[PDB]
Amino acid sequence: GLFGAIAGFIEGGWQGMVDGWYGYHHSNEQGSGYAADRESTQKAIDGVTNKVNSIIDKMNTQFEAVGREFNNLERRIENLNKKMEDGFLDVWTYNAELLVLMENERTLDFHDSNVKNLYDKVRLQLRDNAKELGNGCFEFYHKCDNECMESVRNGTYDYPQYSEEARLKREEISSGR
Amino acid sequence: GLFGAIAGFIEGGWQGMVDGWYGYHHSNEQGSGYAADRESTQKAIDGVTNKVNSIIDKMNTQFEAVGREFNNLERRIENLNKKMEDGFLDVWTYNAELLVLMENERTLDFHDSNVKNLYDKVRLQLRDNAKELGNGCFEFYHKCDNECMESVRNGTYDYPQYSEEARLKREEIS
Amino acid sequence: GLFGAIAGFIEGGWQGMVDGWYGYHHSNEQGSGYAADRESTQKAIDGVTNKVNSIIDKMNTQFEAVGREFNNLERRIENLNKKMEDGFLDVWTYNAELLVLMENERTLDFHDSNVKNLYDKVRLQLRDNAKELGNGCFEFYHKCDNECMESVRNGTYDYPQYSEEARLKREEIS
Amino acid sequence: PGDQICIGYHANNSTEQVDTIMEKNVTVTHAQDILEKTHNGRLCDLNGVKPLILKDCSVAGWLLGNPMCDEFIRVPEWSYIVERTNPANDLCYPGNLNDYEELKHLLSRINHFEKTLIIPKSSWPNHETSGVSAACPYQGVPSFFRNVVWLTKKNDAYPTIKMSYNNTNGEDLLILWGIHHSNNAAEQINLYKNPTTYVSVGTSTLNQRLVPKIATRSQVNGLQGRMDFFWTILKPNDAIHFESNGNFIAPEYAYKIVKKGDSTIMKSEMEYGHCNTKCQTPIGAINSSMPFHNIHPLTIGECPKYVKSNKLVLATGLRNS
Amino acid sequence: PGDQICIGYHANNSTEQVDTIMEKNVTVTHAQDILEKTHNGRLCDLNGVKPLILKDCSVAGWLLGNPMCDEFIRVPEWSYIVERTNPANDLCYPGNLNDYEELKHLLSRINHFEKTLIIPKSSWPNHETSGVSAACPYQGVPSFFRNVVWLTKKNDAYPTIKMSYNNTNGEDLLILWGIHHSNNAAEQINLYKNPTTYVSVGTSTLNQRLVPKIATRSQVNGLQGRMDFFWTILKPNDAIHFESNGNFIAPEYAYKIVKKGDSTIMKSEMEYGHCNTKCQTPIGAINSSMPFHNIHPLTIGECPKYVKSNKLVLATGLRNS
Amino acid sequence: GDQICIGYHANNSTEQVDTIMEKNVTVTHAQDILEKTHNGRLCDLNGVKPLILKDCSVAGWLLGNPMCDEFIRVPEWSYIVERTNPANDLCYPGNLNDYEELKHLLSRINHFEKTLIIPKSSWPNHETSGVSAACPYQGVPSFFRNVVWLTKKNDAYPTIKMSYNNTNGEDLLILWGIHHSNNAAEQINLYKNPTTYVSVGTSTLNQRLVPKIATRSQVNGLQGRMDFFWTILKPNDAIHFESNGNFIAPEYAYKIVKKGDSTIMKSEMEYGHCNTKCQTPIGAINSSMPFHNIHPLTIGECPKYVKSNKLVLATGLRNSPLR
Numbered sequence A: 001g002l003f004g005a006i007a008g009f010i011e012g013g014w015q016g017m018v019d020g021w022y023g024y025h026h027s028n029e030q031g032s033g034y035a036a037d038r039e040s041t042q043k044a045i046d047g048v049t050n051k052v053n054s055i056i057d058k059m060n061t062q063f064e065a066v067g068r069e070f071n072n073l074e075r076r077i078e079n080l081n082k083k084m085e086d087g088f089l090d091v092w093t094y095n096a097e098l099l100v101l102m103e104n105e106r107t108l109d110f111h112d113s114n115v116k117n118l119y120d121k122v123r124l125q126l127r128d129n130a131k132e133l134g135n136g137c138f139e140f141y142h143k144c145d146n147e148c149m150e151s152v153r154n155g156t157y158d159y160p161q162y163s164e165e166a167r168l169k170r171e172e173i174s175s176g177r
Numbered sequence B, C: 001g002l003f004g005a006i007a008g009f010i011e012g013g014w015q016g017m018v019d020g021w022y023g024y025h026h027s028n029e030q031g032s033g034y035a036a037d038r039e040s041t042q043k044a045i046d047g048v049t050n051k052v053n054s055i056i057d058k059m060n061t062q063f064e065a066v067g068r069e070f071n072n073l074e075r076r077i078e079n080l081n082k083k084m085e086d087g088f089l090d091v092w093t094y095n096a097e098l099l100v101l102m103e104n105e106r107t108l109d110f111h112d113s114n115v116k117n118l119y120d121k122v123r124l125q126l127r128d129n130a131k132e133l134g135n136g137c138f139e140f141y142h143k144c145d146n147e148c149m150e151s152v153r154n155g156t157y158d159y160p161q162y163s164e165e166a167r168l169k170r171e172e173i174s
Numbered sequence D, E: 001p002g003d004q005i006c007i008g009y010h011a012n013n014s015t016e017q018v019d020t021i022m023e024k025n026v027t028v029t030h031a032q033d034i035l036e037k038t039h040n041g042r043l044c045d046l047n048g049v050k051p052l053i054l055k056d057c058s059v060a061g062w063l064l065g066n067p068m069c070d071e072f073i074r075v076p077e078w079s080y081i082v083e084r085t086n087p088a089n090d091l092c093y094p095g096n097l098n099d100y101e102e103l104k105h106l107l108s109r110i111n112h113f114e115k116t117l118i119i120p121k122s123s124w125p126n127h128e129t130s131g132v133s134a135a136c137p138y139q140g141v142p143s144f145f146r147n148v149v150w151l152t153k154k155n156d157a158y159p160t161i162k163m164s165y166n167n168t169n170g171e172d173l174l175i176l177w178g179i180h181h182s183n184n185a186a187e188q189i190n191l192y193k194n195p196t197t198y199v200s201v202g203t204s205t206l207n208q209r210l211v212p213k214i215a216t217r218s219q220v221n222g223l224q225g226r227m228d229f230f231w232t233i234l235k236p237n238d239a240i241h242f243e244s245n246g247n248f249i250a251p252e253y254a255y256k257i258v259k260k261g262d263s264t265i266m267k268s269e270m271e272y273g274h275c276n277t278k279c280q281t282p283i284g285a286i287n288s289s290m291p292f293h294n295i296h297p298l299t300i301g302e303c304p305k306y307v308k309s310n311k312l313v314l315a316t317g318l319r320n321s
Numbered sequence F: 001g002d003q004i005c006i007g008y009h010a011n012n013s014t015e016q017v018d019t020i021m022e023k024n025v026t027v028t029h030a031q032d033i034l035e036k037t038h039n040g041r042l043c044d045l046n047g048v049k050p051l052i053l054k055d056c057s058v059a060g061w062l063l064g065n066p067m068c069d070e071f072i073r074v075p076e077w078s079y080i081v082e083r084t085n086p087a088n089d090l091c092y093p094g095n096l097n098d099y100e101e102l103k104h105l106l107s108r109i110n111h112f113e114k115t116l117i118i119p120k121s122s123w124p125n126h127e128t129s130g131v132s133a134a135c136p137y138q139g140v141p142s143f144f145r146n147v148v149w150l151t152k153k154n155d156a157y158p159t160i161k162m163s164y165n166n167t168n169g170e171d172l173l174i175l176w177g178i179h180h181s182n183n184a185a186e187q188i189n190l191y192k193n194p195t196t197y198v199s200v201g202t203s204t205l206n207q208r209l210v211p212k213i214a215t216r217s218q219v220n221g222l223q224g225r226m227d228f229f230w231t232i233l234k235p236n237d238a239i240h241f242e243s244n245g246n247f248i249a250p251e252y253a254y255k256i257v258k259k260g261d262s263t264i265m266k267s268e269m270e271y272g273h274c275n276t277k278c279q280t281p282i283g284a285i286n287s288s289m290p291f292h293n294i295h296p297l298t299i300g301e302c303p304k305y306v307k308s309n310k311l312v313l314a315t316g317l318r319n320s321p322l323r
């Protein structure tokens, strides 16, 4: 997509995540599991709901009485009504089709954007304490327990605490050990 | 926003920046202050102005005379005029309302992209010579003075001149 | 809306890239040359073709006969037809001009996004085995022959293979 | 190995597909259609007001009282009129109703309608009022329009009629009358005794003088004669004035009429459905808040915009895999 | 204790709000409305041409010269016509003007207009030309239309009229005439002495023959009689031929007319405002470059597209915090 | 150090597109969606040739103006082409009733066959040799070819009582008229009956026409007028005529079949021996583009008419300078 995350470096979605639109999967020695990011999921749901509602609510409907009230000696006037009725059908059809096409492209890019923002927030926190895999995952160079994982999820991840332990691990892989 | 900057990792705009749409805030031993990026601001001003003028100047206006010229035994024909007038009002209202909603979303994301591109430009010069704080700020390692700060906003950050000084600092916290 | 690559940190396109829209340029011991990225170029071509065809194919046309069939004592009816003709011309002209303007902005940002995504995919593969110069280029620490370059262009770059070789050179930059 | 955290997005088993400007047939986790394709298939009240359904009659036959027509009862108010595409009992005696289409438009939506006797047959003491034709049968026996009177010579005499009616009611009156066109001088004398004849009608605004055209015409309903009918709207406290020395089709019943809104005539073969609607089509009523529909162009009511489309599907979820 | 440089964006004290496709009520540092909502409340000129404002008279009354119609002085050119919603002065003698709405449309915008005396009363030597009526008073005294002549019998005679007039002026001529419908045979003889009359009018294109309709009618302005008026455009060097033996309302004045543009009648009670505009509405003029407005649907000129909206606020600044 | 670089394509294009936020932006490729080209000739519409009247109007062609050369017989057409001001409309001045509604009915005709319905020989008690100088063929007085001027024979005009039954299986367009004479002397000299009438009756038509004796202005050198009327006689229905003077009788009628509707095009051009889906007065257009700026008066399936010179969609990338 535009932001390169969905179907980009993040290959495919997660059938196993059911509690939200975007979020995290973790794996350590205690176990593994999915956790949904409620903030971005709720904002995206509200935005998408507003989009559909805006496309519907902004329409203006007024009473009209459409019939065929002209006789055999008034064909010219009926032709005027036909040219008018077909004119509005062409206008509404083209606008409705293209609006759907354009809005769907933006909606998919909106989801792609939301995922990339979540990814970038994690990357800035972890820095070199974890390795970017290029697939949407980060391999920690230190032990990250269930409480450490939540710190990454909610923004309070402490880089200096693990900076040492991470640094020693970087050397071991570097030296072919 | 679509990009991560506005109301994102930068949690709010600066009331203290009275010049420019986007710019920098510095803090060092000499002092602190704001400084706008004129090129990014002017480009954004020109873009937004062109958008508003395009929405206005592309409208084609034509002399029309709109009245009620049909009598009590031509009430079928005016219904034809009533259906025509109401149809165009519905078309114009729907398009105008949707145009504002769409363009406003694009406008907000335009400002978001401009800020993010400015942030990435600074990060490109600084590279490892500074630490990203995740809130739109860069914490230096190498004692950036006022002329050093100007070089970052200018784009002439002398990376080799500070590479060592930042390297010695970087090892101190590790 | 810009993604910062086209006319951004990549300053200008290549005349030498003649076989695709987005691509790579490499320089090593064996020489230098251009190489088009077929996958992203084809995705871009398919998408841009779909946009043009969607704008064309979604139009519904029907048979109409447009003349001037009202006499000098029916000028009120002809004015009704004039107001309808002018209304539809005003609707179509405004919509078509703005659709072109809006979709032109989107297309140029689509190209910018594709170039940026291509840059990021290379950056994730390379990691610290090379440093990014900020102009859209990467300077390798290890020796990257043509086969190595081809592995970067497709998805098969072997980061562990050159990990120590790049690490030793990265320490020898003194 | 090593501890890992990943960023990802939702996926389900949905097969819903949407189109975009750049891509076609993209599977998404959720989608919503903004096109309305469903109708209840019944004729309904328009905002709680029942339509006037003229089952086997046209408007002209219902108004003039065709003998094969008034299976109806009193409908004092309606929102629109349902006519079948080709009604059967239009004008038993061949002829025309003047300004028929404008009259139909006027009656499309009526706030109050009430047939009222204005000129009883006793008001013609010196004229025959039992004018009867076989083209207007009631149960096979020849009859005539129930709301107008065929005036015929009596005692070999057709005295010049100089009569008037004054609208003493508080509402507008729709009044219909007509002139009978004879076929030859012999028939003209046999019916009215006056070879040269006229029908003059006057109100505060109407000023009409009709003369029969005595000529040979092609047979319609087995008849070569014609009856041309005309109408007017008589304002309260106004009076209509009739002068005729033959060929007069006098009014007997009129209609109190109150108009506060406008509608049209709907061509449909369906029957009343005992339902309420905001939007009616000839093939069914629609209850929708959706902005677009593709059901039928000939709508009455507050309706979504008509489009030529099978689906307008908005992606509301994520791209699926 | 390390030095810091930050990237940020402007924020101010603005409380201006805009809506987006996905968010509502977003505060922005700057915004701009594109919906015109302001008029001047005045009736203005249209592109340097003043409108013809008929104060208390209808177009028919002004054309025929109703004595209660002031004059409005010689206005030789106008861009559009302003009538009040319910004009007080029109045909003072009851009747009709033929093709009235087409005539009103033709006169909506006129390049040159000049009243011309084409048939003076001296041209009627064998007829009485002093006819007046209490339905057409002037200062409480019976009078008549100032631009036509009520011809009646003289010395117990109405000789047949055979008159012609050649349009010697270099411009098109709008000629008005009429026929009078009497109430009974006695009154017909009292005025024209001929029981059966007619009016014949002929040009290079017009072939007209009117006959009076002598019948009872309801009183309008105290009168049961009616006068039906007709018109034509006599082209330069063309001659109109009049022919009557009674009931003829002869033309006296006619109008030189030049037409090169089209307009409409505007229904408004407002007065002239000594202003200029490109866009006029019945409640005011619009000076704007904005693409949309919501003032009034019945606009004249080059106007923004009318919409049903209260604001179209485009965001220009940033998301304010 | 070895290097790999990311970049995009650039070329020598100078094509400029416009965006909502930028103007005159050079791109590597672009496509115009506004049709601007027409072939400049008048074509068939969906394989059906139009009706082209060179010097004739619809009224003159129908009634048979002698000046209108009766060139060929087109059994069907898709639309009708007229000049702005045709030369031979009504050689004898008058009117054609409901001319515009009749013109609209004849714009697209599935089948057209001129037919003799009332021969000149069916007027044994009346003179049928009526001619006029305002209707000249080859420099000598003539008349409309499809109607007959009925004058008096042997100082007599017996009352006509004639009826024609449509025995064909297709609709019949029948035209007749009444002649307005100048004065009483002319009325006697031509019909001998001072008070005359024309009565026409069908299953739906019920018409009585009376001449108007008065002085008019001279048109085509004549002061009289001939008002023409028409009707559509359905199969197995009879039209009944009755007149004692001033009756312009029908001779040739027209079998007609109508399956669709069209309009009348005002063009001064001629046949271009071509086929098209969309016709304009200045030339046909053949394209699939959604918009055109050729001409508003189109007939056929056409793009949407817009007031625009270019609608250029960018397809390539923002292009770079010369280096």
Ligand SMILES: CC(=O)N[C@@H]1[C@@H](O)[C@H](O[C@@H]2O[C@H](CO[C@]3(C(=O)O)C[C@H](O)[C@@H](NC(C)=O)[C@H]([C@H](O)[C@H](O)CO)O3)[C@H](O)[C@H](O)[C@H]2O)[C@@H](CO)O[C@H]1O
Binding pocket: D130, D131, D132, D133, D134, D135, D150, D152, D181, D182, D191, D222, D223, D224, D225, D226
């Ligand atoms: C009153 C009477 O007996 N008249 C005789 C004619 O009816 C008859 O001419 C025949 O008429 C036939 C149709 O007759 C009706 C009808 O329309 O059914 C008979 C109705 O009683 C009569 N109504 C009234 C109120 O008088 C009606 C009317 O005369 C005219 O039709 C009005 O236009 O006609 C049918 O058409 C036959 O073809 C026709 O010969 C003649 C000759 O037999 O004698 C009359 O005494």
Ligand SMILES: CC(=O)N[C@@H]1[C@@H](O)[C@H](O[C@@H]2O[C@H](CO[C@]3(C(=O)O)C[C@H](O)[C@@H](NC(C)=O)[C@H]([C@H](O)[C@H](O)CO)O3)[C@H](O)[C@H](O)[C@H]2O)[C@@H](CO)O[C@H]1O
Binding pocket: E130, E131, E132, E133, E134, E135, E142, E150, E152, E181, E182, E183, E187, E191, E222, E223, E224, E225, E226
């Ligand atoms: C000429 C005369 O003496 N006429 C007497 C009638 O006036 C009168 O009927 C009454 O007429 C009233 C209106 O009278 C006028 C009018 O319109 O004011 C009087 C005008 O002088 C006259 N004009 C001419 C040129 O003759 C005009 C005209 O007769 C009619 O408009 C023609 O339709 O009428 C009003 O209508 C009263 O209600 C009515 O009774 C009768 C009977 O008293 O005597 C006549 O001699």
Ligand SMILES: CC(=O)N[C@@H]1[C@@H](O)[C@H](O[C@@H]2O[C@H](CO[C@]3(C(=O)O)C[C@H](O)[C@@H](NC(C)=O)[C@H]([C@H](O)[C@H](O)CO)O3)[C@H](O)[C@H](O)[C@H]2O)[C@@H](CO)O[C@H]1O
Binding pocket: F129, F130, F131, F132, F133, F134, F141, F149, F151, F180, F181, F182, F186, F190, F221, F222, F224
């Ligand atoms: C039949 C004949 O000889 N008629 C003589 C008149 O023609 C003539 O009046 C002069 O008529 C001139 C035009 O005459 C035509 C025409 O329109 O060309 C001549 C046609 O033969 C005639 N056709 C028929 C069937 O009668 C036709 C017709 O009379 C009228 O058009 C009907 O309205 O008229 C021209 O107008 C001259 O100005 C006029 O004097 C008179 C007297 O000269 O003698 C008639 O015998």
Ligand SMILES: *[C@@H]1O[C@H](CO)[C@@H](O[C@@H]2O[C@H](CO)[C@@H](O[C@@H]3O[C@H](CO)[C@@H](O)[C@H](O)[C@@H]3O)[C@H](O)[C@H]2NC(C)=O)[C@H](O)[C@H]1NC(C)=O
Binding pocket: D166, D167, D237, D238, D239, E218, E219
């Ligand atoms: C239809 O009938 C009504 C009711 O009869 C007529 O209106 C009424 O007409 C009478 C005279 O026929 C009026 O009475 C007279 O009024 C005046 C005041 O204007 C007074 O000077 C006289 O002494 C006398 O009372 C009456 O006012 C009038 N209106 C009402 C409400 O009763 C009406 O004219 C008739 N319509 C037609 C077209 O004939």
Ligand SMILES: *[C@@H]1O[C@H](CO)[C@@H](O[C@@H]2O[C@H](CO)[C@@H](O)[C@H](O)[C@H]2NC(C)=O)[C@H](O)[C@H]1NC(C)=O
Binding pocket: A146, A147, A148, A149, A150, A151, A154, A156
């Ligand atoms: C954000 O995540 C951190 C890290 O898990 C949370 O802090 C820990 O909370 C648990 C709760 O049982 C305590 O036992 C730990 O001692 C906390 N660690 C600290 C304070 O370093 C924190 O509560 C989370 N915040 C929110 C709002 O969810």
Ligand SMILES: *[C@@H]1O[C@H](CO)[C@@H](O[C@@H]2O[C@H](CO)[C@@H](O)[C@H](O)[C@H]2NC(C)=O)[C@H](O)[C@H]1NC(C)=O
Binding pocket: C146, C147, C148, C150, C151, C152, C154, C155, C156
């Ligand atoms: C992807 O890039 C790799 C790396 O060069 C290519 O693999 C090499 O292909 C050449 C072809 O001559 C062989 O000589 C090398 O031995 C291969 N190197 C390996 C397998 O490590 C590979 O072919 C590329 N894929 C495509 C589809 O072009």
Ligand SMILES: *[C@@H]1O[C@H](CO)[C@@H](O[C@@H]2O[C@H](CO)[C@@H](O)[C@H](O)[C@H]2NC(C)=O)[C@H](O)[C@H]1NC(C)=O
Binding pocket: D218, D219, F165, F166, F236, F237, F238
């Ligand atoms: C015109 O002629 C047709 C053909 O004869 C007439 O219709 C037929 O009339 C006869 C005698 O009444 C019937 O037996 C037939 O059933 C009719 N139809 C056909 C197809 O032959 C028709 O009536 C004539 N026109 C008028 C006005 O009477």
Ligand SMILES: *[C@@H]1O[C@H](CO)[C@@H](O)[C@H](O)[C@H]1NC(C)=O
Binding pocket: D024, D025
């Ligand atoms: C998309 O799906 C529809 C319906 O299944 C099919 O007709 C069409 O060909 C498909 N198009 C593509 C490009 O797959």
Ligand SMILES: *[C@@H]1O[C@H](CO)[C@@H](O)[C@H](O)[C@H]1NC(C)=O
Binding pocket: E013, E014
């Ligand atoms: C906002 O600030 C400007 C500039 O200081 C000032 O002129 C204006 O009055 C302020 N508005 C409010 C509402 O405080």
Ligand SMILES: *[C@@H]1O[C@H](CO)[C@@H](O)[C@H](O)[C@H]1NC(C)=O
Binding pocket: E024, E025
């Ligand atoms: C937006 O603001 C308007 C006016 O201030 C208010 O009526 C409306 O409810 C608001 N909408 C929200 C808060 O969603």
Ligand SMILES: *[C@@H]1O[C@H](CO)[C@@H](O)[C@H](O)[C@H]1NC(C)=O
Binding pocket: E166, E167, E168, E237, E238, E239, F217
């Ligand atoms: C009117 O007068 C002019 C000039 O005298 C003359 O040329 C023209 O023929 C006249 N028109 C008529 C119809 O007599």
Ligand SMILES: *[C@@H]1O[C@H](CO)[C@@H](O)[C@H](O)[C@H]1NC(C)=O
Binding pocket: F016, F023, F024
């Ligand atoms: C764009 O270029 C054309 C010629 O190529 C020129 O006429 C036009 O003025 C230019 N537009 C702008 C906005 O500079």
Ligand SMILES: *[C@@H]1O[C@H](CO)[C@@H](O)[C@H](O)[C@H]1NC(C)=O
Binding pocket: F275, F276, F277, F286, F287
């Ligand atoms: C229209 O032009 C195209 C060119 O691609 C051609 O194939 C087609 O046959 C043309 N149509 C006609 C009716 O000439």
